[PDB]
Design a protein around this ligand. Structure first.
Ligand SMILES: C/C(=C\C(=O)Nc1ccccc1C(=O)O)c1ccc2ccccc2c1
Length: 596
């Protein structure tokens, strides 16, 4: 069954003092040096690879080549994404067994099993714990990216935020005679922080909550006549509006924490009797206040709106926010464009003054991030035609919609992808399946919607750009699969790749063709399967070229075997777009190296 070792620190073990009957005594030395390293207080920054090379004696590996093989694993762990694994067989395949001293008294055929077992011990008891001792792993939530923050820096940060919450209303010290139902976690968020709770969970039953919130999502679409579909709204809006569109996007600051608890309670109380009535309402009422959380041995009451992390917060915040909408957003206009999420409001009208009446109004209702506001109003400092909202870029002038990406500088794009599924494991000798599973559609589905492929409001040149961009993402996933195929499946002949790559271009071109047909509108000119296939090949070429030495032969095969030229039907097309990496994709990091 089991093929994978998970790279996550979460699975580390607490090391014994010495080892048992099973393990060779050499592991005791490393355990010792591990404890010694932890006790040594040094002024100058910690390089894990360098420490580990003092902790695990060289006699454990016998040769530099063996040592270098183990530490490539350590190096992945030092650079892991969430959910990433390697194969368990990486830990024994291709080691120089004749050169490992502690293994000479064992006949050759039992060696790999022992090496695997001891390697696992080291990684579980020494490598992962050393990292945990010096670093806090932080999920940036930008894909599966993990950042490793020096533990003293994090604790300092964690304390500095803890006192701010203390010396505000947000966190009040409790007498311990309340008993918490989750632990307060402080997460660094770019410039600020996020104070969420991790539940045990259990709490009576988890299905009780799921069919409790299910009772609420009813109420949301009952006494609030809201419907809303971003695509339908934008489409119906743009088609009736002939003149220049004006619009604004307003970022709502901490919607969860700006919930006025008393107001939400009265909202819950009355009147959903046919829907919830009393036994439920009473449990929700006291749930919103008081919210009590475990921390540093101490128990605290959270007095700043809903707690992010509580299962009910999301649906109750939506419930609350819909009420604020009926309350303060009543005189907007039946003919204006409006759409919202918990974090977002997006409003458009051909009447510029209404876009002010909206900006001013929304500032009166909510606390909003005013630097994160985007508008094309000429009175603003820096007016802007293109408005990002819900993973999309809306151009208020051209009405075109593009997918938003989405990439900090220095971001390693391999973090966007999930190649390893611990629940559905692929043996080390089926790389083709791994490849094919990686090229499956579901992951890229939100780049392949009516927003990207319609020709109602979007021009055909826009559909092509959207498509080319989605295929650049797919190509980067392909590239990241290639890296995994080399370092974990240990592939050396990449021949089988050609036909998998070819099928993939065929399949994505075909899904595009269908989507374009289904959502065809008056702006359609003529899209062939051939044209789409070429855009796709071009997208792969623009990524593969980033490793011309590795991908030389593949690039040449594409240029000699595939059709890369296409006929365009709009003279307004930017033909250059299809020649090169677009700048938003041009400087993502594709090289993996340890930095702690
Ligand atoms: C996809 C691929 C090669 C590949 O992935 N290589 C590597 C990946 C990671 C690390 C090292 C290497 C390496 O080869 O040195 C490839 C190249 C040329 C091809 C030509 C024709 C058909 C298929 C082809 C496949």
């Amino acid at each position: 069954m089991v093929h994978y070792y998970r790279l996550s620190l979460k699975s580390r073990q607490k090391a014994p003092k010495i080892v048992n009957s099973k393990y060779n005594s050499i592991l005791n030395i490393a355990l010792k040096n591990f404890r010694l390293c932890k006790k040594h207080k040094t002024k100058k920054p910690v390089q894990i690879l360098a420490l580990l090379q003092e902790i695990i004696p060289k006699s454990y590996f016998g040769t530099t080549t063996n040592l270098k093989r183990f530490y490539k694993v350590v190096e992945k762990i030092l650079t892991q994404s969430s959910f990433e694994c390697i194969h368990l067989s990486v830990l024994h395949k291709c080691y120089d067994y004749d050169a490992i001293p502690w293994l000479q008294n064992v006949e050759p055929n039992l060696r790999p099993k022992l090496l695997l077992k001891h390697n696992l011990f080291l990684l579980d008891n020494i490598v992962k714990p050393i990292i945990a001792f010096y670093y806090k792993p932080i999920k940036t939530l930008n894909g599966h990216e993990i950042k490793f923050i020096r533990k003293e820096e994090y604790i300092s940060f964690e304390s500095k935020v803890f006192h701010k919450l203390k010396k505000m209303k947000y966190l009040v010290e409790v007498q311990d005679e309340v008993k918490p139902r989750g632990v307060l976690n402080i997460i660094p968020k770019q410039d600020n922080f996020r104070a969420i709770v991790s539940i045990f969970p259990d709490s009576a039953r988890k299905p009780f909550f799921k069919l409790l919130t299910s009772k609420i999502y009813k109420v949301l679409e009952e006494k609030y006549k809201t419907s809303g579909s971003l695509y339908t709204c934008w489409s119906e809006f743009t088609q009736k509006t002939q003149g220049q569109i004006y619009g604004i996007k307003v970022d709502i600051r901490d919607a969860y924490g700006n919930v006025k608890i008393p107001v939400l309670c009265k909202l819950i109380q009355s009147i959903p009797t046919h829907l919830l009535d009393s036994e439920k309402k009473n449990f929700i009422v006291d749930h919103i206040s008081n919210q009590f959380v475990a921390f540093r041995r101490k128990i605290y009451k959270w007095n700043h709106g809903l707690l992010q992390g509580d299962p009910l917060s999301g649906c109750l915040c939506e419930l609350y926010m819909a009420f604020m909408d009926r309350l303060y957003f009543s005189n907007l206009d039946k003919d204006a464009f409006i759409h919202r999420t918990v974090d977002d409001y997006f409003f458009c009208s051909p009447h510029p003054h209404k876009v002010y009446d909206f900006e001013l109004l929304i500032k009166g209702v909510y606390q909003v991030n005013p630097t994160k506001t985007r508008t094309n109003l000429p009175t603003h400092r820096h007016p802007q035609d293109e408005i990002p909202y819900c993973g999309k870029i809306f151009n208020l002038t051209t009405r075109q919609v593009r997918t938003l990406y989405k990439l900090p500088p220095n971001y390693e794009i391999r973090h966007k992808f999930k190649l390893w599924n611990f629940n559905n494991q692929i043996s080390d000798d089926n790389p083709a399946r791994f490849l094919q599973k990686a090229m499956d559609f579901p992951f890229i589905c939100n780049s392949f919607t009516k927003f990207e492929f319609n020709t109602v409001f979007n021009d055909q040149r826009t559909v092509f750009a959207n498509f080319y961009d989605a295929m650049i993402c797919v190509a980067y996933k392909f590239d990241a699969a290639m890296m995994a195929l080399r370092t974990s499946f240990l592939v050396n002949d990449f021949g089988f790749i050609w036909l998998v790559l070819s099928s993939t271009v065929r399949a994505y071109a075909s899904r595009a063709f269908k989507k374009i047909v289904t959502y065809k509108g008056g702006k359609y000119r003529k899209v062939t399967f051939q044209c789409l296939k070429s855009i796709a090949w071009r997208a792969f070429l623009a990524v593969l070229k980033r490793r011309t030495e590795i991908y030389k032969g593949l690039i040449d095969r594409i240029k000699s075997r595939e059709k890369l030229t296409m006929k365009f039907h709009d003279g307004e097309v930017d033909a250059s777009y299809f020649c090169k990496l677009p700048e938003k994709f041009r400087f993502v990091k594709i090289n993996r190296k340890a930095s702690i």
